[PDB]
Design a protein around this ligand. Structure first.
Ligand SMILES: COc1cc(-c2ccccc2)ncc1C(=O)Nc1ccc2c(=O)nc(-c3ccc(C(C)(C)O)cc3)[nH]c2c1
Ligand SMILES: COc1cc(-c2ccccc2)ncc1C(=O)Nc1ccc2c(=O)nc(-c3ccc(C(C)(C)O)cc3)[nH]c2c1
Ligand SMILES: [Zn+2]
Ligand SMILES: [Zn+2]
Lengths: 284, 284
């Protein structure tokens, strides 16, 4: 509580400290308080409130280049997870999309295992204000370049680093370097294709307890994510590219003939995706 | 013009009418004025302003069941077209989308004519507040039923009733009853596919002047529209339906297995589309 103590002492208002001590007023709280709030906590003299407000203004605006406000506004930031009720239609819709997009793969379930259906344990909504704001800023920028259309989609993503993504967001500096379409971030319409990557490329070595890629006990996690494609380049063959083709904001391809197989997408900028839903499940 | 006069006379404030005559205050304008605005025009006495504001409150809220506000606020409604400059990148994006999706058709250009690309004369943004609000309300409804995803796309629409659509909106009561997917409103990713319907089903009789379906002279108009798909049912054969399949919000399919052909979509509720862009063009 020393920062507010110094601030109040510099104004000659140390005699008010008692109030600030009882009301748990820290400097970050104080810089958001006007005449009304200050009157609520017992600062009755107009001169004291005037001095406090003027000092806050001289700090936040007078030294804007030092960014004192950002230093004081780190509280409350971070991710929270909100559990969906299985009886609500949001949970049911997410589950229906998860289940209805399973299919057989070219390999006999070597990477993701053998299964026809999932057992969904829980689905969570990922809430992070800074990452959401970054995503929306990028979405606006892309829409302005694509005749007012973001071309937004919902796609699955499987990664052994789901926790890092949900806490720090998608990052093209951790792209899939060895991917068929180059160093980007990959998403799939089929949930099974993303499930093939839950433990790593080619399924890695399986679940950490069993070293089994087809384990039916160990809990898996997928992300159902908001992805901005904008103008998407249609790619028919493997091509290693570091960034999007000129004039485009993503790449879309299909590694299998027409049928039960759905499309797949690559974005080369981390701010074009947001991990909206975290799904915990088992394969049956 | 007499509504304001009766309203003011009923309050015993007819001596103010001269002011209201010089400032061109009508009842629709008056119902939106508070103490500040009335002070600006010269109603200095507090009592007069109080009486006027209470009269407006008694009319608007007191008789809400009669909806006088709707009667008064009809002015300003309607559609306006904002022309896009060819130098702007929005115009370039729309024209690129128009030009890049031309392709050959099963018929030798019988319905739409023989051409490789268009000559774009102008592109206009359609602005209508009521239709936009209807579309956004429906989009919210669909998003709440599809895990917070509207699945919104931008698709071409051709019709000989473009003016009716832009001034009244899309209407399933004017659906394409004979369409292969039933009585619905049809959109195409290929611009040339929608170009076949600008003069009617199968091209109709052609241009109104020369009655030529391959006319290179008469100006044609297309719509590039925001379409909410929600959970879309993938249809593989021709099946006539009146509404969406249960649990879905639209239908997607394509009659041609060729890779060049893009997808086509059908909606069965007019509020799920909005005609954002009107394109005037010729075939070359
Ligand atoms: C556009 O995608 C493809 C196209 C073609 C193609 C080839 C020829 C012609 C036409 C098309 N072939 C393969 C893919 C493909 O690999 N798709 C996916 C789909 C989902 C995920 C996924 O959920 N996760 C990771 C992931 C995530 C993290 C990591 C790290 C780097 C963390 O290990 C690696 C891969 N990759 C995917 C990759
Ligand atoms: C999903 O769409 C199809 C699917 C299949 C199919 C068949 C078998 C298997 C799988 C798929 N075959 C044909 C169509 C089709 O007709 N698509 C379109 C595409 C654009 C427009 C368009 O821009 N305009 C009008 C229009 C508009 C208005 C009117 C009026 C007002 C005259 O009624 C008539 C037609 N119809 C379209 C129709
Ligand atoms: Zn295991
Ligand atoms: Zn003509």
């Amino acid at each position: 509580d020393f920062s507010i103590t110094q601030f109040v002492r510099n104004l000659g208002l140390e005699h008010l400290m008692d109030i600030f001590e009882r009301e748990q007023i820290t400097l970050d709280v104080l810089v958001e308080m006007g005449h009304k709030e200050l009157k609520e906590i017992g600062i009755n003299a107009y001169g004291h409130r005037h001095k406090l407000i003027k000092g806050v203004e001289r700090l936040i605006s007078g030294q804007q280049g030092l960014n004192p406000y950002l230093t004081l506004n780190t509280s409350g930031s971070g991710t929270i997870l909100i559990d969906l009720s299985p009886d609500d239609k949001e949970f049911q819709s997410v589950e229906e999309e998860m289940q209805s997009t399973v299919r057989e793969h070219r390999d006999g379930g070597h990477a993701g295992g053998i299964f026809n259906r999932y057992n969904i344990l829980k689905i969570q909504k990922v809430c992070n204000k800074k990452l959401w704001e970054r995503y929306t800023h990028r979405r606006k920028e892309v829409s302005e370049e694509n005749h007012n259309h973001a071309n937004e989609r919902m796609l699955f993503h499987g990664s052994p680093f789901v926790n890092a993504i949900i806490h720090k967001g998608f990052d093209e500096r951790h792209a899939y370097i060895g991917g068929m379409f180059g160093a980007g971030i990959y998403f799939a319409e089929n949930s099974s294709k993303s499930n093939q990557y839950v433990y790593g490329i080619g399924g890695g070595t399986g679940c950490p307890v069993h070293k089994d890629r087809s384990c039916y006990i160990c809990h898996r996690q997928l992300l159902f994510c908001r992805v901005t494609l904008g103008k998407s380049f249609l790619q028919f063959s493997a091509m290693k590219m570091a960034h999007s083709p000129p004039g485009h904001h993503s790449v879309t391809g299909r590694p299998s003939v027409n049928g039960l197989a759905l499309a797949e997408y690559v974005i080369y900028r981390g701010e074009q995706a947001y991990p909206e839903y975290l799904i915990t499940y088992q394969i049956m």
